[PDB]
Design a protein around this ligand. Structure first.
Ligand SMILES: O=C(O)CNC(=O)Cn1c2c(c3cc(Br)ccc31)CC[C@@H](C(=O)O)C2
Ligand SMILES: [Ca+2]
Ligand SMILES: [Cl-]
Lengths: 366, 362
């Protein structure tokens, strides 16, 4: 095995294929990357047995076929640590891989490519293509609401839902919910899967904001994403996801609109004197005005008054201010819409200018 | 107690005094506020050191003192919009804070409960530019010990000699010294400033033209810059003599680009022992070679061009120490000054003798 390649053509691929690798593997070879020279192409693969990322690099300098595995962290650090515009010559010499460039030489330990574990083979039964940016928006809009290591394992992940011509993402930790729907211009079957949170992050981070389209394949227990030179594959979470349609407030008739930043800064100051554990704040809403109050066990008190667009009936309601701020921070828009009903119902939050993303927070009594 | 001040004027003072404060005596988690003689005084302390900020009151105000949670009060002010005006007043056991239509009511502890550092006398005084103090601390800070049982090493020596103010920091494995002339005839004297004080001292240098005034007593140091007064206790014990650590006659002079050299050591370090982190250097005429290897039999090798005349030698180092030096230097070229394979090495900016770094071999 032999190749010579520019440092810069190796770094992005190394970032991508390093993502999956867990910090304390059950096998020695799981700390390594698989390297293959074949048909004019170097492929790198990293895995953790749950998910896998393969990157491809075209080889325009002379090369010799073969495969081996090297420690991922070290080989990445060497390449990244080498100077800008460097040529990186790699060759397999016995049970060592030789890396050199200019007058820097490294000898890396190998494990055999034959021991590198592959993911279970599977069949695609739902496929579609879409702009990278559409996938990026779907995930960014909802990712923060995924559970982290809940015992309800199916919440530690994101629901991907196909219906008609749109793709929808949903996330919830059992307390707050985020949903986002985008049309993708392909007739799709009605289908639903749960991607594990680590898989969702790899996917998100494999999208480089560029013009390459993203192709998605979904099987019974697996999902795969292909964009340009990168192919990501992950297991699905085998569980049942809650129905998001049930939590959405029915016919909220009291819509409040305000500048996202102004509402955010007001909640952010009020939060300073909220309960540190339960983070409850009170909204008093009246004609074109909102008053926000907070207090903590030490009886310190905050109050914020802003001008808003609001014409409905006067009402009160409490919320977890961290959840509201998470929503306002994910939105990053000019104007926000808060769709209110009463003191005992939940609230749905959106960009004033767009219904594509919706967020649901529970009422707090105080 | 009442005052009304613009956010811009309150923010940096708050930031400075509040920065290092924790609960502990919960009142150590509070700032002392005093309105007196047209001035708002904001004071913070952990009993070892103290930061006092004065700010002029150009609007109507009323005298009096209280104590509020430092973090919450800073966060509130910081969270207010740019150009905002902040009206503060005492009412009951609470401190009211009003800006626009944002209102806040904070808890208080009595100003009488707020502790003072003991009185002391100045024995040594001088002034210097901020930029000089910044440079003196920056050059050496990373070589202080952190939590060594030799308490005298967890901190920085400040020495006056002739016209020079000098800083020294060592942890027993490596050492940094930096001397700067400050245009004054100084008495021969030294004190040890605790690392926490070093950091606050550093952080009080805004980067403006206000000079610094320093006062040293037998158990205290103080620095005035602009409207801030930092006061800290000193550390007991006999600090080592940097001249004993410096090599006596490092005849062998090596010269290389600092970034190039730093890059090589860093790459080589990848394949060094994870615990020891040793690298070998082989010096020969106009050439430096760096090698590293680990238990797994993995090997790194780097070869650079340098300006070296003198005998060939081999010497081992912990790479992180060499990297800390090379990153502290921030220069074009570095001089490596050597004696032999079992003796300390000295490292300087090739273009300045103003700072020197010493590292032991492995
Ligand atoms: O601190 C160590 O790990 C042991 N170092 C020495 O035995 C020699 N030594 C010391 C110091 C030192 C500093 C350097 Br660069 C090299 C060897 C050194 C500074 C602190 C000194 C003290 O104990 O007061 C000792
Ligand atoms: Ca340069
Ligand atoms: Cl010096």
């Amino acid at each position: 095995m032999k190749f010579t390649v520019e440092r810069e053509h190796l770094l992005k691929p190394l970032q991508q294929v390093s993502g999956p690798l867990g910090g304390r593997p059950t096998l020695p070879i799981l700390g390594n990357l698989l390297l293959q020279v074949a048909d004019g192409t170097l492929s790198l693969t990293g895995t953790d047995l749950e998910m896998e990322m393969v990157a491809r690099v075209a080889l325009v300098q002379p090369h010799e076929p073969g495969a081996t595995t090297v420690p991922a962290r070290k080989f990445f650090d060497i390449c990244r640590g080498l100077p800008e515009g460097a040529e990186i010559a790699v060759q397999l010499e016995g049970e060592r891989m030789l890396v050199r460039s200019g007058r820097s030489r490294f000898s890396l330990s190998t494990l055999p490519a034959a021991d590198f574990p592959n993911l279970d083979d599977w069949q695609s039964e739902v496929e579609f293509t879409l702009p990278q940016a559409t996938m990026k928006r779907l995930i960014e809009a909802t990712q923060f609401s995924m559970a982290h290591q809940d015992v309800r394992y199916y919440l530690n992940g994101m629901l991907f839902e196909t219906e008609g011509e749109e793709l929808r993402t949903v996330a919830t930790d059992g307390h707050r919910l985020a949903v986002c729907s985008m049309p993708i211009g392909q007739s799709l079957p009605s289908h639903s899967v749960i991607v594990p949170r680590k898989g969702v992050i790899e996917l998100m981070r494999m999208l480089d904001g560029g013009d390459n389209p993203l192709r998605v394949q979904i099987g019974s227990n697996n999902i795969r994403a292909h964009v340009g030179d990168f192919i990501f594959t992950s297991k699905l979470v085998d569980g049942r996801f809650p129905d998001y349609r049930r939590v959405l407030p029915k016919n909220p008739d009291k819509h409040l609109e305000a500048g996202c930043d102004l509402l955010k800064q007001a909640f952010a100051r009020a939060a300073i004197l909220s309960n540190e554990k339960f983070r409850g704040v009170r909204l008093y809403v009246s004609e074109n005005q909102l008053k926000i109050t907070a207090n903590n066990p030490e009886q310190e008190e905050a109050e914020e008054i802003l001008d808003v667009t609001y014409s409905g009936a006067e009402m009160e309601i409490g919320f977890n201010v961290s959840y509201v701020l998470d929503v306002l921070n994910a939105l990053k828009c000019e104007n926000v819409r808060m769709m209110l009903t009463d003191s005992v119902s939940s609230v749905q939050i959106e960009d004033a200018a767009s219904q594509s993303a919706a967020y649901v927070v529970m009422p707090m009594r105080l």
